[PDB]
Design a protein around this ligand. Structure first.
Ligand SMILES: *[C@@H]1O[C@H](CO)[C@@H](O[C@@H]2O[C@H](CO)[C@@H](O)[C@H](O)[C@H]2NC(C)=O)[C@H](O)[C@H]1NC(C)=O
Ligand SMILES: *[C@@H]1O[C@H](CO)[C@@H](O[C@@H]2O[C@H](CO)[C@@H](O)[C@H](O)[C@H]2NC(C)=O)[C@H](O)[C@H]1NC(C)=O
Ligand SMILES: CC(=O)N[C@@H]1[C@@H](O)[C@H](O)[C@@H](CO)O[C@H]1O
Ligand SMILES: CC(=O)N[C@@H]1[C@@H](O)[C@H](O)[C@@H](CO)O[C@H]1O
Ligand SMILES: CC(=O)N[C@@H]1[C@@H](O)[C@H](O)[C@@H](CO)O[C@H]1O
Ligand SMILES: CC(=O)N[C@@H]1[C@@H](O)[C@H](O)[C@@H](CO)O[C@H]1O
Ligand SMILES: CC(=O)N[C@@H]1[C@@H](O)[C@H](O)[C@@H](CO)O[C@H]1O
Ligand SMILES: CC(=O)N[C@@H]1[C@@H](O)[C@H](O)[C@@H](CO)O[C@H]1O
Ligand SMILES: CC(=O)N[C@@H]1[C@@H](O)[C@H](O)[C@@H](CO)O[C@H]1O
Ligand SMILES: CC(=O)N[C@@H]1[C@@H](O)[C@H](O)[C@@H](CO)O[C@H]1O
Ligand SMILES: CC(=O)N[C@@H]1[C@@H](O)[C@H](O)[C@@H](CO)O[C@H]1O
Ligand SMILES: *[C@@H]1O[C@H](CO)[C@@H](O)[C@H](O)[C@H]1NC(C)=O
Ligand SMILES: *[C@@H]1O[C@H](CO)[C@@H](O)[C@H](O)[C@H]1NC(C)=O
Ligand SMILES: *[C@@H]1O[C@H](CO)[C@@H](O)[C@H](O)[C@H]1NC(C)=O
Ligand SMILES: *[C@@H]1O[C@H](CO)[C@@H](O)[C@H](O)[C@H]1NC(C)=O
Lengths: 273, 406, 313, 98, 49, 49
């Protein structure tokens, strides 16, 4: 399902780590404008014990970076697809997670969506899902490779109240696909909480590619907590998967006396701003 | 120096500024990440099953470094043939990507790894581009690639269909056809095998013993840099005006221990004026504070040409322990006297010089703001003058200047 | 220093700049003239007394209270409480210290107060002549058309009013949002000019980069000549703009300092018959106090009130 | 001009023009400030003449240091020189008042 | 204001103006300093009552 | 629009420019200093010669 919500103040990341404690520095970079519309995208592939084909997972365009946020138990979302046309006619990149791994790879796969949905994928009845990877079915001419530590260090606080929220920003400025991230598990059910949180870079890799296509892959062998409705025209519907589109904007960031960004004021938003 | 700046052979009383004293760096350092971490270059060289020339072992180099100073003790390195790229200037270069192929050849095939040549072997097995930049290293391999019976484990194509484009592979089993009989599969008369035995023996002399040669393909086209060199390392000096060359930094200053609280990932340091002041070195993962090298406008204090030739120097705003000390700077050539007089040559905060016989020298001292006077104010005491003095002072004021009509 | 700011530690840059004519000697001459004028300004303003006067050990001035403006020996700086309240409230850009330190500007101020409380205006003309403070207040009243008649008949009342005004001037200076706007604005203007001048170094000025080492390494002196010359002329233009703005600001400050010197010579060392010059209302006295890069006058004035109507002819 | 043809001389000449004109610009800009400085003194001299000379001034330490009596102007090269006459007292004497 | 005066309606000219640094925010501050001062002059001369 | 057509050679066509001279821009034909136009050249070795 799909719906619309408000971004509030979120999606602010360090553009570079020149330590400037107590400096009101301003930069004109790609950012998520304050109070911007963010579209809840959702995937619903589960129904009792029958097949119930999906036809879900619509197309998600990618333009000038993207801000993604989610709250997942362990590995609900494990796949990232970055490549035009998602076919064997244009170069593509895939970020695939694991228990403790990452499968960042540049190639030209025709198809890579074979999650092998479990007929017994009912989480309330069983929670077994192993070795259902089924990727890189076809590869024509693929050379660039990379493996490192995974991206999301999910923490368990011995209860479900610790609704950890993961945020990431993907922009493609002459390679070096920065994956700025920040995990704030202070959330208790609020959607995009008021406050402020900065994002710190994790990795990057230069290739050079006109990626305009975005997609995510789920842990479909164990799929649940996916409701469906007719959410449209500024409504709400449980998705656990946010997305927002960045724009080139001027921001003025206030660095703390320690070094972190306490808060930032946007430009071209309000006359006071 | 005063005579040189103020163009005249007579210098009058007054403090004069002539130049600026500037400490110079005493040596140069450079430091990049810890060692080269894990460049897999050794795995390519330290091996036992090198791919032959019939199919080279192409490896992508984007997780390695350009440290061309640690790979030399893994082979004899008899031949160090290099293309237009300078072997000496390899560490500084940041190659976007390096494409290396490992293969084993013989003595007569050493010249086959070369652009713009003619012959047989490289026209069937390994084709090089015309502008093949990089380096190739050749060394003897009779220690491993020798059999008393025959080492027929490395093969090579010899009768491929036709010439191939640079860096092209034609690994495919086929019945070689050359003549008027298109062999239908028997591969008999006028049909010889494209591959040929490529064995080695130790009895053979120079030029026939097996050799292992590797190649380097570079690209100096303007692109994002991936493979970079650590520029070896230098000892990290401290508390001394030097030329620091940390990661992406080129400046001079004094490196001191830092009490800052750099959060784990860090690049540089900054201030309100957008200047670098705090850096960290990956060799130690510790924060260093950078202070601009000591400077300050030197000044000359003179009692006038028509009184003496001795002068006092006033290195300004510098603790010149790096002789008297003042808030404005340190005075050399003038001894500080504890007396007080109306000062005729201002220096700095309260300090003024003068030429006195106290055998005459220059003395600096604290200004005497005036003769001390205490009035006798009381409840019913008044002072009324009984005399006057008609004093004629003088006042001078400009009223106009020279009109100009350029 | 032009060479270090424009070029830094480069030899070819200095050689190229040596051609751009005497665009340095002029800069240094102008800035040294400004510095000398600044050091002299305080000399005209404060050093109006040939001799440093000291207050008597016992301080009884007929009921008038001067504890808030005379120096307090308890503090090591020997500054008045009001002066203390006022005081509380790197690329070749050297900041020379003032010739007169703030510990002796306060001494000039103390001498001026001692002379004006213990000798009236007589020490402004010639030798200081002792005079009881009530007699001096009678003089100042007589100077504005009010006879000596009503000073002594109200001496306790006027003493209480003056003490209350002195007490509340400190509260007015403290509780106000910003009364020291002019001094703080001068300091902020200088700091802003210096910060803009520093930030101008990291400006491309139409060149590839603002780093001389970067513009040197990536090219050769023949081809990098145009880029380094563009950087040199841009930085020279920035320095010239800075020095011209400094000259204009210094002219404004010189006008202000001449006004302050005239105010000290008339309001303090005598009584001014000019209207609305030494504070609103008829002028009685004026007490100077130092302040960071400035002076503060306490204009003790005489304001009538409680008028009554009458028939006249 | 006689050593180079137009095309690169035009570049070189522009370099001299943009330097000489900018040098000339600096002279005039620096000349305006000095003129403002002189007028401030010239206006002060006019004020000093209208009070110290054509009259007696009650302003302390304006027309000479001390009580003012009269003044005498004297012309000077590019300026004026005043001869303030003053009544500095001397030889004081203690007394008892009431 | 520099932006329109130096470059009428040009985005790329505005980008080149950014390379010159604070030649304009300094310039605009200088002019607005005169403007506020002018209102102070008339305020001080006339509003004496 | 004025189109001036003539044939000289490969070497001489290199100095069809203001100021620079190959003994063709002082006696034969020179291009004006403020020339705001275009120049097009192509080989004619196969022709004549
Ligand atoms: C008379 O006036 C003189 C000064 O003109 C006074 O002499 C000084 O007074 C102060 C204050 O009491 C003393 O500290 C000095 O020691 C005095 N000087 C000398 C040389 O004695 C004097 O006190 C006044 N009164 C009398 C009665 O002479
Ligand atoms: C003196 O007292 C008041 C003013 O102090 C005068 O009364 C004012 O008179 C004017 C015009 O005559 C009116 O506009 C005001 O409204 C009056 N004010 C008040 C408070 O009444 C009064 O006339 C004057 N003369 C006398 C003899 O009292
Ligand atoms: C509850 C029910 O109707 N289950 C049926 C199942 O028996 C059948 O085998 C399948 C397809 O044949 O469709 C479903
Ligand atoms: C490299 C690439 O993808 N180019 C595309 C092309 O394939 C497509 O036909 C056209 C319009 O859809 O837009 C562009
Ligand atoms: C109620 C119940 O236990 N249902 C099934 C059981 O029949 C089956 O044997 C098991 C397999 O693991 O899964 C569960
Ligand atoms: C090259 C590669 O990744 N192969 C994987 C294999 O490791 C995995 O066991 C299997 C099932 O998950 O899917 C495929
Ligand atoms: C904050 C905001 O304006 N959100 C808008 C909403 O108002 C609108 O109805 C919807 C399209 O139907 O798109 C989104
Ligand atoms: C390459 C190298 O020497 N790295 C050193 C390591 O040996 C040492 O253990 C560590 C702190 O002890 O600092 C770093
Ligand atoms: C591209 C190129 O120059 N290839 C030649 C190859 O044809 C020849 O057999 C060999 C002999 O030295 O030298 C090399
Ligand atoms: C780790 C981080 O983000 N910030 C820390 C802060 O929590 C800590 O108090 C400080 C020590 O002075 O060092 C920094
Ligand atoms: C100089 C040149 O190109 N001349 C050719 C000529 O040889 C050819 O016969 C004719 C036919 O199209 O076209 C033209
Ligand atoms: C300085 O001294 C020299 C020689 O002692 C003398 O000729 C000259 O006149 C002197 N100048 C002055 C101004 O006294
Ligand atoms: C300055 O020099 C004095 C001379 O002894 C020394 O005591 C002091 O520590 C120095 N301070 C600095 C900051 O160099
Ligand atoms: C000068 O006076 C100072 C002040 O205490 C004293 O320390 C010093 O010994 C005196 N003599 C000198 C500096 O020759
Ligand atoms: C002045 O009178 C006061 C009144 O209390 C007295 O305390 C003081 O001692 C007197 N001083 C002199 C010098 O007579």
């Amino acid at each position: 399902t799909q719906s619309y919500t408000n971004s509030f103040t979120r999606g602010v990341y360090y553009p570079d780590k020149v330590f400037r404690s107590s400096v009101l520095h301003s930069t004109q970079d790609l950012f998520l404008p304050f109070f911007s519309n963010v579209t809840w995208f959702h995937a619903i592939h589960v129904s009792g014990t029958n097949g119930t084909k999906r036809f879900d997972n619509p197309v998600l365009p990618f333009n000038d970076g993207v801000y993604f946020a989610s709250t997942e138990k362990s590995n609900i979302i494990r796949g990232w697809i970055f490549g035009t046309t998602l076919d064997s006619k244009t170069q593509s990149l895939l970020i695939v997670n694991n228990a403790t791994n990452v499968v960042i790879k540049v190639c030209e796969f025709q198809f890579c969506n074979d999650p092998f949905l479990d007929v017994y994928y009912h989480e309330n009845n069983k929670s077994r899902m192993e070795s259902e990877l089924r990727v890189y079915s076809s590869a024509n001419n693929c050379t660039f490779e990379y493996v490192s530590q995974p991206f999301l260090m999910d923490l368990e606080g011995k209860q479900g109240n610790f609704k950890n929220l993961r945020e990431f920003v993907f922009k493609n400025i002459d390679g070096y696909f920065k994956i700025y991230s920040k995990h704030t598990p202070v959330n208790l059910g609020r959607d995009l909480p008021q406050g402020f949180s900065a994002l710190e870079p994790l990795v990057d890799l230069p290739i050079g590619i006109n990626i305009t296509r975005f997609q995510t892959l789920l842990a479909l062998h164990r799929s649940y907590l996916t409701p469906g409705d007719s959410s449209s025209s500024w409504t709400a519907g449980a998705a656990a998967y946010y997305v927002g589109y960045l724009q080139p904007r001027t921001f003025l960031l206030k660095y703390n006396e320690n070094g972190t960004i306490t808060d930032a004021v946007d430009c071209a938003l309000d006359p006071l701003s | 120096e005063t005579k040189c700046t103020l163009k005249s052979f007579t210098v009058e009383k007054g403090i004069y500024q002539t130049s600026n004293f500037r400490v110079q760096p005493t040596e140069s350092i450079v430091r990049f990440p810890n060692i080269t971490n894990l460049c897999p270059f050794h795995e390519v060289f330290n091996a036992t099953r090198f791919a032959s020339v019939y199919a080279w072992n192409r490896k992508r180099i984007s997780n390695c470094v350009a440290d061309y100073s640690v790979l030399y003790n893994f082979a004899p390195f008899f031949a160090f043939k290099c293309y237009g790229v300078s072997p000496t200037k390899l560490n500084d270069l940041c190659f976007t990507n390096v494409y290396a192929d490992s293969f084993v050849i013989r003595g007569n095939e050493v010249s086959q790894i070369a652009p713009g040549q003619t012959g047989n072997i490289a026209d069937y097995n390994y084709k090089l581009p015309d502008d093949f930049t990089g380096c190739v290293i050749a060394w003897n391999s009779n220690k491993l690639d020798s059999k008393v019976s025959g080492n027929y484990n490395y093969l090579y194509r010899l009768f491929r269909k036709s010439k191939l484009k640079p860096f092209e592979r034609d690994i495919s089993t086929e019945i070689y056809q050359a003549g008027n009989k298109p062999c239908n599969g028997v591969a008999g008369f006028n049909c010889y095998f494209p591959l040929q035995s490529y064995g080695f023996r130790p009895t053979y002399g120079v030029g026939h013993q097996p050799y292992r040669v590797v190649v380097l393909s570079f690209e100096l086209l303007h692109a994002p840099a991936t493979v970079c060199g650590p520029k070896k390392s230098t000892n990290l000096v401290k508390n001394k005006c030097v030329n620091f060359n940390f990661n992406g930094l080129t400046g001079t200053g004094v490196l001191t221990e830092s009490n800052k609280k750099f959060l784990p990932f860090q690049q540089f340091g900054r201030d309100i004026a957008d200047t670098t002041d705090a850096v960290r070195d990956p060799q130690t993962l510790e924060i260093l504070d950078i202070t601009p090298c000591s400077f300050g406008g030197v000044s000359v204090i003179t009692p006038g040409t028509n009184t003496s030739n001795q002068v006092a120097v006033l290195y300004q705003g510098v603790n010149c322990t790096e002789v008297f000390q003042t808030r404005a700077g340190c005075l050399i050539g003038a001894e500080y006297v504890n007396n007080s007089y109306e000062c005729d040559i201002p220096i700095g905060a309260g300090i003024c010089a003068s030429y006195q016989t106290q055998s005459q020298s220059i003395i600096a001292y604290t200004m005497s703001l005036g003769a001390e006077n205490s009035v006798a104010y009381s409840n019913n005491s008044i002072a009324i003058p009984t005399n006057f003095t008609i004093s004629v002072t003088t006042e001078i004021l400009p009223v106009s200047m020279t009109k100009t009509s350029v | 220093d032009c060479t270090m700011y424009i070029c830094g530690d480069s030899t070819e840059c200095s050689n190229l700049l040596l051609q751009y004519g005497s665009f340095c000697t002029q800069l240094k001459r102008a800035l040294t003239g400004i510095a000398v004028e600044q050091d002299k300004n305080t000399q005209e303003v404060f050093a109006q007394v040939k001799q440093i006067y000291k207050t008597p050990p016992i301080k009884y001035f007929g009921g008038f209270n001067f504890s808030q403006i005379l120096p307090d020996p308890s503090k090591p700086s020997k500054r008045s409480p009001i002066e203390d309240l006022l005081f509380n409230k790197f690329n070749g850009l050297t900041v020379l210290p003032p010739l007169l330190t703030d510990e002796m500007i306060a001494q000039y101020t103390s001498a001026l107060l001692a002379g004006t409380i213990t000798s009236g205006w007589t020490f402004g003309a010639g030798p200081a002549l002792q005079i009881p403070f009530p007699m001096q207040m009678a003089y100042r009243f007589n100077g504005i058309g009010v006879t000596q008649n009503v000073l002594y008949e109200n001496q306790k009342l006027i003493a209480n009013q003056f003490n209350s005004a002195i007490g509340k001037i400190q509260d007015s200076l403290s509780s106000t949002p910003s009364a020291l706007g002019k001094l703080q604005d001068v300091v902020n203007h200088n700091a802003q000019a210096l910060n803009t001048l520093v930030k101008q170094l990291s400006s491309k000025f139409g060149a590839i980069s603002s780093v001389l080492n970067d513009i040197l390494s990536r090219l050769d002196p023949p081809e990098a000549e145009v880029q380094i010359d563009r950087l040199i002329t841009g930085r020279l233009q920035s320095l010239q703009t800075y020095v011209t703005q400094q000259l204009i600001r210094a002219a404004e400050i010189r006008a202000s300092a001449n006004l302050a010197a005239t105010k000290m010579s008339e309001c303090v060392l005598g009584q001014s018959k000019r209207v609305d010059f030494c504070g609103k209302g008829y002028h009685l006295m004026s007490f100077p106090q130092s302040a960071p890069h400035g002076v503060v006058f306490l204009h003790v004035t005489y304001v009538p009130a409680q008028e009554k109507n009458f028939t006249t002819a």
